[PDB]
Amino acid sequence: AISSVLNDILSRLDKVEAEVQIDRLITGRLQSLQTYVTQQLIRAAEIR
Amino acid sequence: LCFTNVYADSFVIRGDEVRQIAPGQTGTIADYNYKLPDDFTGCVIAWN
């Protein structure tokens, strides 16, 4: 995406191009939470 | 196909304004006298 900062993108693109650039950040971000929570569910299983 | 409801929006414009009639646009027509939505389903039919 043309920035890491979500508001900047709104300040430069319309509803059709902001949707592309923002959907990179959503997909990548959601993949980040799906990663951390997997590592943590595993970590937790060691602790049990 | 079949459709729930249908319309025809009828008007006259400059040939150099046909581009503004696409959804996700800006310019004096798109801003101040005819805008299409982002989820626009339909067809633009334009001729000299």
Contact A6, A25 (CB under 8 A): yes
User: What are the structure tokens assigned to B40, written together?
Assistant: 């626009």
Q: Quick check: B24 contacting A, CB < 8 Å?
A: yes
What gap in Å lies between CA A6 and CA B42, rounded to an integer?
31
DSSP strands (E only) in A1-48: none
User: What are the structure tokens assigned to B17, written together?
Assistant: 């304004």
Single-letter code of the amino acid located at B20: Q
Single-letter code of the amino acid located at A30: L
Name the experimental technique. cryo-EM
Quoted resolution (Å): 4.4
Q: B27: alpha, beta or left, given left = phi > 0 and alpha = psi -120 to 50? A: left
Rounded alpha-carbon distances, angstroms, from residue A41 to A3, A27, A28, A46: 31, 21, 20, 9
Nearest C-alpha neighbor of A14 from the set B17, B22, B47, B15: B22
What gap in Å lies between CA B13 and CA B29, rounded to an integer?
9
Chain A partners within 8 Å of B24 (Cβ): 14-16
Chain B partners within 8 Å of A12 (Cβ): none
Query: How many CB atoms within 10 Å of residue B21?
Result: 19
Cβ contact B26–A16 (<8 Å): no
